[PDB]
Design a protein around this ligand. Structure first.
Ligand SMILES: O=c1ccn([C@@H]2O[C@H](COP(=O)(O)OP(=O)(O)O)[C@@H](O)[C@H]2O)c(=O)[nH]1
Length: 701
């Protein structure tokens, strides 16, 4: 019952904790509490190691004790908050934060945590405010600084940008050198000028967080299959994602599990999130050989057991370091071969991952040192899209002529042909080097369509055919607006709907604004200045970034009307309105990935400049697969030149649009059947290699 004794125990456990011996520390803390139970400091310490080990429910118990013993303990309130946050009790976490701030107005950590809550809930201006307050109270505060840095990045606040990037590097450099966990998230490292080494290290450090959380389970190594006998000659492939539902990932690969060859493969889909009722989740469950809902097995131990009992040979990680990931499953290694795929544009940096599925364009062998996994190449690009299936109505288009452009007033529809054949005089414009663009002339009918658009009407009727206003698809068929269903009506899309000029080159970029940096905007200003008859089309993504971007745009000499903003739209509208643009200017810092497949499906030429990171090379990979090497810039000047040519030489622009318009169908880019077959071949290399007794090595065909 001696406090001086218990205190000595506490001091000793801190020692064991800094040596990285988490397990012995817990034993010492527990000894201190057995001696002197009213020991606030011991409860608080034991709580944060229990939190590290993912034993949240029990850590919460000890934080509460620490609070009862010392009601002035703002540090304990703030930590207990983090625990509740991790338990998905954000209401209770918020209470813990504000209460710490009430007790100690100058307690920086609580302000930083309060900010994070806002940052997660999309309230960026509020998060930015609380971070700034935390930094005023505690100027040397890496976590706060780096998160604020990301907030500023999100809304395009480039105040002291150059100096900011320099301090981020200095922070990561100092933390890595002192063997601490870097304040920069692995997913965000792709945005800052860190060395390839630093990025991988960050990733690794983060991957190790899973280890304390699984070591606690005390699980033995799993015995993996050495053959395919128990699976009747079938390779068992497990796809693990928290995004089987209305999420970009499903928009890319939902068709794949059903395209696997049942003779050689047995597809197991492991959902980390619960059913959201969308068709995406419905399709994958219906076409996968087995669909397992792991969201109902919260214990990573019991969940990995499930995977192992299914007998998976190749386990595929589609989350990496994104929201909803449960990499503890991979840390446990329930499969002999575990690969990174599609969902995360980076390296896990962790031992528990063997391959990263990619291609020679995205990840050339000379930069194989930015990954920790062995490279596994797909023949063309590793990127795939399900556009051919989700938006087949965009396979053909038709225009209306107002005195011929291919992107001023556009009609799409599965029944578009039958409607045209009902019209009196339709001119059929040929595309050279089997393809044509029907042109509806300015008639009484063509006037009624314009009319519906100008008056903001939902829809009209022409010769019994249903003509829909592209702005109101969600009132006509919400499932069709989200991409879950193919539209059953003919849709009209115009530049007037979005305030785009009818007589100008339209450069577009439909990415989140965080992908844009000062150097990129400067590049785009140079283009707009060299092509005076043009505008830049961007999205309010988020809206608060618009005033910031516009502000810098005018510092570069661009009048307001040069950049035109639109609101974020439903999937189908988003993809469809891409048809309106003449050219898409890709962001070099982090390319449009899904967004890249989007603009390409509309037959819109995309100009890109491949960097060194995987994230910055996906666009070029897409383009080479498509067959457009002349849209790939080697440097900033060639990028600006390529865009200035497409903008000023109208025949060259017509020729390239015609290329993308044809090749998006003829190339293997949107071919999910071929892609799946290539993927299967890649798997079999992986398996043959492992069965032959070898350890993972690069897979270049
Ligand atoms: O106006 C828009 C703009 C974007 N998107 C969708 O939002 C997602 C963007 O997510 P992400 O930032 O991850 O795109 P990526 O980085 O993969 O290109 C994509 O599915 C787009 O199709 C949309 O539905 N409407």
């Amino acid at each position: 019952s001696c406090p001086t004794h218990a205190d000595s125990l506490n001091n000793l456990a801190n020692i064991k904790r800094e040596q990285g011996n988490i397990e012995e520390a817990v034993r010492l803390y527990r000894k201190a509490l057995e001696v002197f139970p009213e020991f606030a400091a011991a409860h608080s310490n034991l709580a944060s190691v229990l939190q590290q080990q993912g034993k949240l429910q029990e850590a919460l118990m000890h934080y509460k004790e620490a609070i009862r013993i010392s009601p002035t303990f703002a540090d304990a309130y703030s930590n207990m908050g983090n625990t509740l946050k991790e338990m998905q009790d954000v209401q209770g976490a918020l209470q813990c934060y504000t209460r710490a701030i009430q007790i100690n107005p100058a307690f920086a950590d609580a302000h930083s945590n309060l900010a994070s809550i806002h940052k997660d809930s999309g309230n960026i201006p509020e998060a930015i405010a609380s971070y700034r307050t935390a930094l005023k109270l505690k100027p040397d505060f890496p976590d706060a600084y780096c998160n604020l840095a990301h907030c500023l990045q999100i809304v395009c606040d480039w105040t002291d940008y150059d100096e900011r990037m320099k301090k981020l590097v200095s922070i990561v450099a100092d933390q890595l050198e002192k063997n601490r966990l870097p304040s920069v998230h692995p997913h965000h490292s792709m945005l800052y000028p860190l060395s390839h080494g630093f990025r991988k290290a960050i990733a690794e450090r983060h991957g190790n967080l899973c280890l304390d959380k699984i070591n606690v389970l005390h699980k033995p190594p799993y015995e993996h299959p050495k053959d395919l006998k128990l699976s009747d000659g079938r390779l068992r492939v497990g796809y693990v994602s928290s995004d089987f539902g209305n999420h970009p990932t499903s928009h890319l690969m939902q068709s794949i599990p059903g395209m696997h060859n049942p003779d050689k493969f047995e597809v197991f889909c492991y959902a980390l999130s619960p059913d959201d009722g969308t068709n995406f989740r419905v399709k994958v469950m219906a076409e996968a050989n087995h669909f397992i809902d792991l969201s109902q097995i919260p214990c990573n131990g019991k969940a990995a057991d499930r995977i192992h009992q299914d007998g998976i040979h190749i386990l595929v990680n589609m989350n990496g370091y994104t929201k909803g990931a449960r990499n503890e499953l991979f840390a446990l290694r329930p499969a002999p071969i575990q690969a990174m795929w599609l969902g995360y544009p980076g390296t896990s940096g962790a031992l528990f991952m063997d391959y990263i599925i990619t291609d020679q364009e995205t990840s050339p062998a000379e930069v194989a040192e930015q990954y920790s996994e062995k490279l596994a190449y797909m023949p063309h690009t590793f990127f795939i899209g399900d556009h051919a299936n989700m938006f087949p109505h965009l396979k053909k288009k038709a225009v209306i002529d107002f005195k011929i452009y291919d992107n001023r007033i556009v009609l799409n529809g599965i029944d578009l042909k039958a409607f045209l054949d009902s019209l009196p005089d339709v001119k059929i414009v040929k595309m050279k080097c089997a393809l044509n663009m029907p042109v509806i002339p300015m008639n009484t009918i063509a006037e009624a369509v314009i009319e519906m658009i100008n008056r903001g009407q939902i829809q009209i009727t022409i010769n019994g055919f249903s003509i829909s206003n592209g702005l109101a698809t969600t009132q006509i068929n919400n499932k069709a607006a989200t991409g879950e269903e193919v539209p059953r009506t003919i849709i009209v899309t115009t530049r007037s709907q979005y305030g785009l000029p009818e007589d100008a080159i339209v450069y577009c970029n439909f990415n989140q604004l965080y992908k844009i940096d000062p150097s990129t905007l400067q590049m785009w200003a140079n283009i707009l200045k060299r092509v005076p008859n043009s505008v830049l089309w961007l999205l309010r993504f988020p809206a608060v970034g618009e005033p910031n971007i516009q502000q810098y745009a005018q510092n570069m000499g661009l009048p307001q009307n040069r950049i035109i903003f639109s609101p974020v739209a439903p999937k189908e509208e988003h993809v469809r309105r891409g048809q309106l643009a003449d050219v898409c200017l890709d962001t070099p810092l982090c390319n449009g990935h899904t967004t890249g497949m989007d603009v390409l499906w509309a037959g819109t030429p995309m100009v890109t400049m491949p960097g060194e990171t995987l994230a910055s090379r996906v666009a070029a990979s897409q383009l080479t697969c498509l067959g457009c090497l002349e849209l790939i810039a080697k440097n900033r000047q060639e990028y600006e030149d390529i865009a200035v040519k497409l903008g000023t030489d109208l025949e060259y622009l017509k020729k390239v649009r015609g290329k993308v318009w044809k090749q998006r169908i003829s190339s293997p880019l949107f071919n999910t059947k071929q892609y799946t077959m290539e993927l299967e071949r890649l798997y079999l290399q992986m398996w043959e290699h492992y069965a032959a007794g070898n350890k993972p090595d690069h897979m270049i065909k």
